[PDB]
Design a binder for these strands. Structure first.
Ligand SMILES: Nc1ncnc2c1ncn2[C@@H]1O[C@H](CSCC[C@H](N)C(=O)O)[C@@H](O)[C@H]1O
Length: 568
DNA sequence: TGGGACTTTTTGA
DNA sequence: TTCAAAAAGTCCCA
């Protein structure tokens, strides 16, 4: 028997990293391909419909299409005599199965000419006369005028973010795919739209994509399109598990249909242990039914713009917290992203760097990283930011410009606002407002394994890897920073935030304002005790010679208080 | 070479 | 004028 994943693996090894990233050339492993193909084609009635059109618009070398060929050959061979009796007796013979499949059943598209030729040769070599016409298109699937729809669509689209995509192509996507593609969206949104649009009535689509669109702000329109145009049959969420070897992406498998049905429920399989060697096991189907995965059902008609895919216990937990809390962080706080210098090496220096003797302390700010943020407090800053925006006189401070900032001048000149003349070559790209940072505030890392909200007492500045917020004046008498960090750092709120948080990679969640500011908060009779416990924790943490042991006990007591307050 | 600590600036709006 | 989102992440080693 043939190894359908050998020539494709060799072609993958031939390419380098840049050409892979520019076109998203990362082929799917055999276990996922087997699961998707057998999920779509296990129950096909080949006698009822012996002309199923099965498409992969990103076929590549044909990881999906060769397995599809094998499944189709078995299907036809098992019912050849029934097909012979029901239809033309001379057309339906075993020796004619091959020519039939390639003529009517397998369709592939890809921009990669060499991959198309390799797949064509692989399809031809499935059998050892007239040259059979193989339905392989070398084209941009997002520009191709498709002349007919398809019974089944399987595959893996390219993933290209908003930085790696060309300007003109992005303009085309915004003009023609505006239903799913805006702002910081991804190309696989457009591939989702194209797959849905050319799926026949009653057809089935099943693809593996990144999982980020399930929760991300950019995926809202795509989620609406999917919810309103297809019936989502199944969502397999791998969370931070590594499905693609040596690839830093988080994957989900999605199966949907356009069948006219009153059924509106979705099977959701969510992995429970992200430390799993998926390729070690024989099938994905056995893994889904094991204890490594949990299964629940979600009513698609009950999906809002946010898809909250949790089991009944977590849904009850989330609903209790939502109903009890009358305020959100957005209601009471002002949030902002950190400084974006545009070139950190030019403006960020070690606080022991000798070059800081050239810079007057009026221009120097304390600089912290995401790892400097712990629970309730921030580590002492190790770095200084040169707030070069306040260097108005270019004639003076020429030592600073020539010996520190100018060492990267060329790179500083390639920033967007310098090319347009908005910024001077030595200025910060996005210097924000100094007064927002130089005050008591709360800071949290932009990516973390857990809630880490700290009170900043030292007017620390930061890059965009740290987000900040401060309480509005009108809400200062109702909420204090100590109480806020007390409740936000609790295990209750850790779980509550992770209910809807954007899962990025293994043990990493996105902590961005678009979801952090939606966290709801409460105040009740337990306010004083929670605030007092938080202040005790802060006092213990700030002592130079101290042990963190009692902090855990205080945290347990505070978690008990919060659970009592929220009735969970 | 797979697992863990850590996270820049480009970009549309 | 100036906000904030975005992992086919990056990068190192035992
Ligand atoms: N605009 C476009 N139209 C069609 N195919 C494209 C495309 N942009 C990228 N591709 C192709 O999409 C493929 C994604 S890699 C996945 C290949 C295959 N489906 C598998 O799972 O193994 C790449 O081979 C790339 O060449």
């Amino acid at each position: 028997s043939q190894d359908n994943f050998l020539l494709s693996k060799e072609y993958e090894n031939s390419l380098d990293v840049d050409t892979k990233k520019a076109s998203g050339i990362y082929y799917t492993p055999k276990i996922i391909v087997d699961y998707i193909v057998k999920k779509t084609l296990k129950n096909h009635d080949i006698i009822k419909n012996p002309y199923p059109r099965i498409l992969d618009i990103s076929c590549g070398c044909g990881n999906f299409l060769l397995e599809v060929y094998d499944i189709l050959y078995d299907l036809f061979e098992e019912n050849i005599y029934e097909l012979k009796k029901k239809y033309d007796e001379n057309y339906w013979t075993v020796d004619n199965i091959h020519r039939h499949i390639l003529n009517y059943c397998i369709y592939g598209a890809d921009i990669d000419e060499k991959a198309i030729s390799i797949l064509k040769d692989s399809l031809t070599n499935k059998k050892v006369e007239s040259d059979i016409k193989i339905n392989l298109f070398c084209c941009d699937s997002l520009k191709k005028k498709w002349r007919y729809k398809f019974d089944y669509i399987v595959g893996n689209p390219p993933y290209i973010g908003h930085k790696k995509l060309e300007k003109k192509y992005k303009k085309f996507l915004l003009e023609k795919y505006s239903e799913v593609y805006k702002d910081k969206a991804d190309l696989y949104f457009c591939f989702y739209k194209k797959i849905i649009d050319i799926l026949k009535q009653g057809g089935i689509g099943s693809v593996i994509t990144p999982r980020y669109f399930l929760e991300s702000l950019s995926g809202k329109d795509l989620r609406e399109y999917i919810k309103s145009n297809v019936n989502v049959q199944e969502i397999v969420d791998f969370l931070g598990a590594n499905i693609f070897k040596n690839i830093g992406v988080s994957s989900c498998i999605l199966t949907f249909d356009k069948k006219k049905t009153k059924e509106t429920y979705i099977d959701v399989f969510k992995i429970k242990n992200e430390d799993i060697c998926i390729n070690k096991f024989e099938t994905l189907e056995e893994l889904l039914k094991s204890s490594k995965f949990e299964h629940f059902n979600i009513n698609q008609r009950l999906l809002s713009d946010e898809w909250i895919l949790v089991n009944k216990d977590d849904e009850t937990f989330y609903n209790k917290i939502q109903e009890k809390c009358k305020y959100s962080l957005e209601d009471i706080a002002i949030s902002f992203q950190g400084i974006i210098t545009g070139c950190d090496k030019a403006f960020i220096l070690s606080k022991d760097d000798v070059k800081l003797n050239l810079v007057d302390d009026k221009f120097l700010k304390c600089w912290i990283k995401s790892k400097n943020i712990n629970k309730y407090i921030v580590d002492k800053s190790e770095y200084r930011l040169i707030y070069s925006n306040d260097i108005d006189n270019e004639n003076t401070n020429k030592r600073i410009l020539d010996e520190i900032i100018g060492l990267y001048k060329t790179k500083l000149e390639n920033r967007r606002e310098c090319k347009s003349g908005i910024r001077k070559w030595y200025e910060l790209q996005w210097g924000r407002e100094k007064l927002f940072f130089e005050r008591k505030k709360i800071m949290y890392p932009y990516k973390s394994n857990e809630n880490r909200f700290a009170i900043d007492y030292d007017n620390n500045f930061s890059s965009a890897d740290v987000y900040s917020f401060f309480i509005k004046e009108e809400y200062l008498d109702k909420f204090s920073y100590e109480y806020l960090v007390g409740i936000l750092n609790s295990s209750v709120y850790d779980k509550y935030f992770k209910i809807t948080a954007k899962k990025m990679s293994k043990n990493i969640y996105d902590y961005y304002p678009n979801k952090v500011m939606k966290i709801r908060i409460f105040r009740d009779n337990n306010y004083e005790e929670i605030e007092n416990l938080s202040k005790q924790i802060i006092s213990i943490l700030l002592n130079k010679s101290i042990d963190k042991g009692k902090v855990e006990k205080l945290q347990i007591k505070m978690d008990n208080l919060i659970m009592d307050s929220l009735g969970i």
